[PDB]
Each structure stands twice: as structure tokens, then as C-alpha cells.
Ligand binder design. Structure first.
Ligand SMILES: Nc1ncnc2c1ncn2[C@@H]1O[C@H](COP(=O)(O)OP(=O)(O)OP(O)(O)=S)[C@@H](O)[C@H]1O
Ligand SMILES: Nc1ncnc2c1ncn2[C@@H]1O[C@H](COP(=O)(O)OP(=O)(O)OP(O)(O)=S)[C@@H](O)[C@H]1O
Lengths: 484, 484
């Protein structure tokens, strides 16, 4: 009772389960990559190329397959971009492992070489990484351009990348990290995509008596109700909010009609029945605390916004909580034709903000298009030469597994994956180039540094470490116990 | 009509047929190699380790398998030793080929790299080959010792190798080739193996009147009968033999009683009804011509032997046709307990004569025990690095196939074939040793030059060229037509 596989039947069962879900997202990789349509139980339709969004919301039930959905989940959490690359590598590390397992090479000798090679791979990517001065805006534009590319070439327009860099360099708290929460994202309609210019609550003001737009507003987020009868029992409740010094008031519950007069009598603007999702947004953006008791409302529990304005944007009158000047907080009015386009243009900026923010924090970038994958592969095979024992073959299989990304890039491009794999490999020997990679549009092998195809070092370093540590643990299983 | 396989079903059918007969002789290789027992239709039993004798006399019927029995057949014809090694390599070249065929790499790109690598392998073995002065007898003893070893360590005794070298160095016709036919092989009984001292016709003299042993005898080989009635019609026939000047007469047919008196009257010794097999032996050893007419018997059709003597060796009185002094022809009295032992001690010398004769003619030897196989493998992988295109992978597969012999040597030894394959490979890098190989008795990797494990260059160069040319032709078949 109830389900168990023995030794060889357990090792092959776990390796096959990791490889089968890896091939599902193997075609999505590359500028000429494929998209996936997922239809669940509800009949809800969604089409996505992003590797992490596919694995999370689709029906997966195999025990070994569920463990590999933690690699991409910690890839989007730590980096964001490179969720597809982190899964495919892990699949190839299982393919090169079972080739050694059938030859009676012990799994512990395999895990001995796999860890030692991954320990060396991290201390080899450091040299081949180029240093990008934190405010070198011409390179930062290229890094942002490389991030928008991959989701679409038509999305990658010269003017869009210039806007993103200006926002990230402004929100840097000297010295000198980058907080991604400081940039506010707004999703509005209107014939745009190009009209995109450098929290939005779907509500109005509780009374027409209240004014419309402050400068340097203090926002009190109340979870508790400000309620009553007919005997001015709210004059205390209104004065308690005035005691803290908050001119803006976001209430999650209902505000009574008597309190509406008194809050407007002071000059304080209030909003009734704001969605619970929007209340959690306001607390983290402005730096506010959600208070569930009006008696204990403190002045240090209030958030700080730059510009609060009830604009009638796209017809609807909504509360524009953003804003600043010499600004530590920036708002991005991401706009497009249909809401489904807007959300995609919103997620495209999410990756573009991350890479520029990572470049400022680190300094660091590596050549994309399967360029640094070849350089690291040839440097680890010569590293394997100086290792005595059976653990050498594990390092050799680790290095031969690194050539999967440049191989799969040709698989989805149209060109032969066997011919180019030799052309780039020969163009890495001795010295040059280190930056030589495959350009899917041109066809021939080109220098990626001059093409503008660059990705942050964290995209490659995290993806290797997350895939290595996962495959090391998966090769340490010989018995599977699955009840029910 | 009648049998045909299409494309992929034809290529896999021919590769599998070559590999299946390669595994049959794969266990025979090495000092700790296995023997094979073959029972045919007649019920005749014979046990042999020699790779070429197995493939020739056993029941083989597959069309693709019969073509690979021409490699070892031309290995024993050209070299002698290394018939097993020539087949196993050809099998691995088919295994590494079908790995490329499943990846849609075209067979002509495979044959392009396989030929170019074999062309380089021949011009890389020339440097790693050591020059052995033709009369350097201390090394020639080691080469002879290495030849006797492989068939048996108990066969390999110090005194035996010293005897062989003296015979080969004497039969050298200056300057300066070695004729293997000049050394006569005799198979006699008696408690020996150690009593082996540095044509034998199973017949006597036709008349007791005839003498027994000449010096510098001229031998007339007659196929025609010297026959008669009762009216001295043989006085012409006897005088016609005397006209040529031959004191020794070997007759294949019957000699009549009247001619027996007249031949003995002259002093000419004759023998009646010598086996047809022995007549062909006498013609090639002494340098004689088989004449089928007594009227045309010429003096230039007579052979020349050193010593002809009717010894009563081992009880039986047989004609000892050998012999010399300052000798261009040498006789080896190979002796043992049972006739089946004698024949094996006779075949063990056959390999020992070849290698010493090849060393005098060439100069040349390479380290055995899978030593030069590793050196050539690492030198062709770096040679593959400087080749652009898909033909590189064919050279890589050609070089990776060379490590089969050192791998199979460990397979039959008892030690791990995965662990040692790394130990020797790492001990070949940069410079040293070139002569590093596996010693099956010691276990650890040792220098083969100091151990005395050396083989002629022709053993390795012929085996590669015979296996490469065969596998190149076999990869050029896509349709099989087999009628009946
Ligand atoms: N113009 C280009 N030429 C060649 N390679 C490129 C180019 N633009 C991007 N790349 C490479 O393509 C890969 C990115 O492909 P994507 O399909 O976006 O997958 P990912 O970034 O691994 O994961 P996502 O984006 O989170 S789904 C990286 O390895 C880039 O270096
Ligand atoms: N003492 C030794 N230590 C290591 N290798 C050895 C030793 N003696 C011989 N060898 C190697 O063993 C191989 C010879 O093995 P064998 O089984 O005799 O097969 P073969 O010579 O290929 O074919 P035969 O003799 O014609 S059957 C050669 O590659 C030798 O260099």
C-alpha cells in the first residue's frame, strides 16, 4: 500500500516525468518561439509564451513533475526573465544523467561532478560578464531593448526603451539599490501603444462637497466602518482622523451620510467601499497601514503619495493616486487599444524594469542568443580534463548539457541544429569571440555585443543554480511512496 | 521479388548485422580473454581464441555479415596478429555512425569525416611509433616475447624468444627484406615444449639399396609415373633424370620395380606415392617445379635443400628435407607432448616470426595494451577542433570510437571499464606518456615501454585502414536486393 517503484523503475519514472514537461515549454524559447493555449475545467481561455505561467495554471498531477515547477516559480520571484531557460536546462541535465546511469556509474559520483561543475560555472561567468556603469544610459537602453525583444519585435520600438531607462534611474535611493515597488503601473485604454507617457482606484468621492486634488497628501487607510444614527455620533470619528492629520481617507467599508458632511466640512476627502484588492495596493504603494479601529489611528500609519486627482480618464471618473517631481516614485501610464493588449504591454514593462534595475545594482551583463552558453561549455570541458576519477564524466555531461539552449534556438528558428552547433563552437576556441552567438533573423553567426542582444548576469547565474540544485536532489531518489 | 528493405530499414539491418558478429569476438581480446568452441554439421570439435579462425569456419548466412569477414581475412593475410582488433573497431564505427544517422546527419558528411580522420590517423601513428634498429636483438627479443604473450603467459618463457630472433636475423637476404617461406616448420612429438631446438615427408626410400643423406642435394619433383613391363624400358627414364643432375627424386605416382634397381645403380634416391599436399610443400620450400613429363625434366626445375636425411625420429622413419649452415634457410623442430599441443606451439611461432620479420623490414613498433589507442584518440579530437562544418562530428565519432579497445581490455580483465578510461586519458594530456597503458595483471596504469608490451606498427595501421574502408562502404548502402 499503495504505490511503489523499485530502484531502476523509480529512477527512470522520475527522470521521464521531468523531461516530459520540459518538452512542453521547449518550443516557446527564442524570438521565433511558439505560444501555448491552455483550456482548464472552467473553459477559460488564455494564450501565453511565458514558461512559468503555463506550468502553474495547467493540470499537473505527477509527483516528480510538481517538484520542477518550483524552479521557474523561484525564477520569476528572483529574476523574472529566463523562466523558460531554467526548465529546459534541468531537462537536459536529466537526459545526460540517465546515459551515465545505464553504464553503472553511481549516482553519488554523478552528484559529485554536477556540483563541482556548477561551482566552477558560477566562477567562470564572472569573467565573461561585462561591466555596465550604473548610469551608462546608451547601454541601459540596449538592455531594456533586449528585454522588450523576445516578447515581440513590433513591441521593440526605439522610443519605448528610452522612456523606461529614465524612470528606473530616478527611483534609485542613493546609495544605491533599486526598489521595483516605487514604480506605479496604471492600466488604461485609448488608442495608444505609442501614447504611453512617462494605485488607480475605480471609485469617486463620497461627497460632491469635497475637493479634488492635493499636493503632498497624507492618506489614512481605514478598514473599520465610520458609521451611525441621527445624533451626530461621527463628530468624534471625523476628529480622530483629523487628529492624525490625513487629508485623504480610503475606507474599505461604508461611510455614513452624517460623517460625509463633517469630513467635507473639515476638507478631508473620503471614498466608500473600495475593493479589498485595491486597499492592499494602496498600503504598499504609498507606505500606509490598514487600520481596523478608528480610535487607534496614528499619524505614522499614513501613506505618502505625490498627486491624488479624480480625473475623468477614458470617460470614467477614477481616483489617480500617483505622482511626484524630483521623484523617488514614478507612475507609468501603460495604455493600449483593448484591455488584453494593455495587460500584455504591462507585463512587457515588468521585465524591462527588472533588467535595468539589476544592471544598476550589479554592473553586470552577458551576451544573449545562446552566446555565453557556448563559452561556458568549452571552458568546463577543459576544466573536466584536470579532474581525475569517474566524476570527470559527470562534469563532461554537465558541460555537454549546456549546449541545449543554442541547439533549441536553432530548432525553433528553422535552421539546422547540427550545423550551427559546430560553427559557433569553432568560433569560440583560443580567444575570440566570447560574444559570438546565433542571430535568428540573419541566419549566420554574428557578434552579439554589436547586435544589441544582451541580458543581465542574474538571468544566467540564477537559472543554472536553480536547475543544478533541483537535478542534484532528483538524482538522490531511489524509492517513491505515493499513497491514495 | 524477393527481399528488400527500404532506406531506414536497410541501413539499420546492415549495421546490426555487423555489430552482432563483432560482439561474438569481443570477449576474446586481451591476455585475460575468452575462448570459443565451434560445433558444425559434422560434429567436429575445435576450440580457438584467434578471431579469424572463428569467423571463417562457423555458419554465417547474413549478406552484411559476410562482408565483414573480409577484414580479418585480409588481416591474417597481410599481418597475422591483430585479427580480433580489426573487427571490434569496425563494430564501434557502426555504433557511432547510427548515432549520427538518427540525428539526420547525412551519410556522405559522415563518410567525408571518417575518411579524413583515417587519413590523419595514419599520419599521426608515424610519430608515436618507435624505431627499432633491425639487429637490436634485445628489443627484438621483447617484440617476440610480446607476440608469444597473448596466446599464453606459460607459453612465454625467456629461452623461447631468444631462439626465434636468431632464426629470423639469419634468413634476411641482404639487403634487406625478410622471406617467411625460408623458415621451415616441423611438427614432431616427444616430451618437449622445452626441447624445441633451433618439409617432413611421411615416407621412406623406395629401395634399401639407395643411400640415406646427401650434402647440397638437387631435388627433382616428378608428377608423372616412372613405370614398366619386363624389358628394361626405364633405363631411358632413369638416365633422363640423371641428365638433369638430381640425386634426390620425389615422385607423386608409383615407381616401378625395374626403375628402382637402376636409380639405386646410379646413386639416385627415390620415394613412391608421396601425398599431393607434401608435393606442393616441397616445390615451394626448396624452390622446385612439379614436372608432369619425364622427357622435359630440366636442371633449372630442381629445388635446393641443405640436408636430406631419413631419420627414425619418434620411431617412424621419415625423410628430413631441411637444413643449412651459414644459412639462408632455417628449420624449426617444433615439438610437444600431444599433436594438438604441437599444432598450437606451431601457430604461436607463426605470429612470432611475423613481428620480428616486420621489425627488420620497417624499423617500427608501437606500445600495446591499449596504449597508442588513447594517444591517437586525443590527437584526433584536437584535430577535429580545426575542422568547420558537420563533418567535424564524424571525426569526433571516429576519435571516440578509438577508445573501444582500451575499454574492452578492462571488460575482460575484471576492472571497471569506466574508471580506467579516465585514468589513462588524463595521463596522456600535454606531453607524457604516449606509452601509458593498462596492465591487466597489475591492475594500475603502467608505462608499456618499460613493461615489454610492444607491437609492430603494421598491427595498428592495417587494422585501422581495413576497418575504415569497410565501414565507409557499408554506410553507402540504402537498398538491399537478396533473391532466393
Ligand atoms: N535578437 C536576438 N538574437 C538572438 N538571441 C536573442 C535575441 N533577443 C533575445 N535573445 C535570446 O533569447 C533568449 C530569451 O528568449 P525568451 O523566449 O524570451 O525566453 P526567456 O527569456 O528564457 O524566458 P521568458 O522571457 O521569461 S519567457 C535569451 O537567451 C536571449 O539572450
Ligand atoms: N602484457 C600485456 N599487457 C597489456 N596489453 C597487452 C599485453 N600483451 C599484449 N597486450 C595487448 O593485447 C592485444 C592483443 O590481444 P590478443 O587477444 O592476442 O588479440 P590480437 O593480437 O588483436 O589478435 P589475435 O592474436 O590475432 S587473435 C594487443 O592490443 C596488445 O598490445
Amino acid at each position: 500500500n499503495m504505490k511503489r517503484y523499485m530502484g531502476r523503475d523509480a529512477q527512470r519514472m522520475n527522470i521521464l516525468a521531468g523531461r516530459i514537461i520540459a518538452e512542453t515549454v521547449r518550443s516557446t524559447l527564442g524570438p521565433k518561439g511558439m505560444d501555448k493555449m491552455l483550456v482548464d475545467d472552467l473553459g477559460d481561455v488564455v494564450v501565453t509564451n511565458d514558461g512559468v505561467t503555463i506550468l502553474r495554471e495547467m493540470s499537473v498531477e505527477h509527483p516528480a513533475a510538481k517538484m520542477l515547477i518550483e524552479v521557474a516559480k523561484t525564477q520569476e520571484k528572483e529574476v523574472g526573465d529566463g523562466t523558460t531557460t531554467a526548465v529546459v536546462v534541468a531537462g537536459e541535465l536529466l537526459r545526460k544523467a540517465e546515459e551515465l546511469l545505464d553504464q553503472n556509474v553511481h549516482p553519488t559520483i554523478v552528484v559529485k561532478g554536477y556540483q563541482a561543475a556548477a561551482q566552477k560555472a558560477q566562477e567562470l561567468l564572472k569573467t565573461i560578464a561585462c561591466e555596465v556603469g550604473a548610469q551608462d544610459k546608451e547601454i541601459l537602453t540596449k538592455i531594456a531593448m533586449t528585454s522588450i525583444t523576445g516578447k515581440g519585435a513590433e513591441k521593440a520600438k526605439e522610443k519605448l526603451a528610452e522612456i523606461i531607462v529614465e524612470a528606473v534611474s530616478a527611483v534609485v535611493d542613493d546609495e544605491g539599490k533599486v526598489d521595483k515597488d516605487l514604480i506605479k503601473i496604471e492600466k488604461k485604454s485609448g488608442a495608444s501603444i505609442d501614447d504611453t507617457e512617462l494605485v488607480l482606484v475605480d471609485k469617486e468621492r463620497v461627497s460632491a462637497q469635497m475637493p479634488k486634488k492635493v499636493t503632498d497628501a497624507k492618506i489614512a487607510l481605514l478598514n473599520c466602518a465610520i458609521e451611525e444614527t441621527a445624533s451626530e455620533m461621527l463628530k468624534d470619528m471625523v476628529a480622530e482622523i483629523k487628529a492624525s492629520g490625513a487629508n485623504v481617507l480610503f475606507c474599505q467599508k461604508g461611510i455614513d451620510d452624517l460623517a460625509q458632511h463633517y469630513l467635507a466640512k473639515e476638507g478631508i476627502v473620503a471614498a466608500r467601499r473600495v475593493k479589498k484588492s485595491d486597499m492592499e495596493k494602496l498600503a504598499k504603494a504609498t507606505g500606509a497601514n490598514v487600520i481596523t479601529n478608528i480610535k487607534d489611528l496614528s499619524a505614522q500609519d499614513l501613506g505618502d503619495a505625490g498627486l491624488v486627482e479624480e480625473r475623468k480618464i477614458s470617460g470614467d471618473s477614477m481616483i489617480f493616486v500617483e505622482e511626484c517631481k524630483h521623484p523617488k516614485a514614478v507612475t507609468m501610464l501603460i495604455r493600449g487599444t483593448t484591455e488584453h493588449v494593455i495587460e500584455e504591454v504591462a507585463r512587457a514593462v515588468d521585465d524591462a524594469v527588472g533588467v535595468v534595475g539589476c544592471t544598476i545594482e550589479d554592473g553586470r551583463i552577458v551576451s544573449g542568443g545562446g552566446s555565453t552558453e557556448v563559452e561556458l561549455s568549452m571552458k568546463l570541458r577543459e576544466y573536466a580534463e584536470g579532474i581525475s576519477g569517474r566524476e570527470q564524466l559527470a562534469v563532461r555531461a554537465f558541460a555537454d548539457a549546456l549546449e541545449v539552449i543554442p541547439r533549441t534556438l536553432a530548432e525553433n528558428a528553422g535552421l539546422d541544429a547540427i550545423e550551427i552547433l559546430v560553427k559557433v563552437r569553432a568560433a569560440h576556441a583560443s580567444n575570440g569571440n566570447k560574444c559570438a552567438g546565433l542571430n535568428v533573423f540573419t541566419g549566420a553567426v554574428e557578434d552579439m555585443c554589436e547586435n544589441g542582444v544582451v541580458e543581465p548576469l542574474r538571468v544566467k547565474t540564477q537559472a543554472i543554480q536553480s536547475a543544478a540544485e533541483s537535478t542534484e536532489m532528483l538524482l538522490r531518489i531511489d524509492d517513491v511512496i505515493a499513497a491514495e
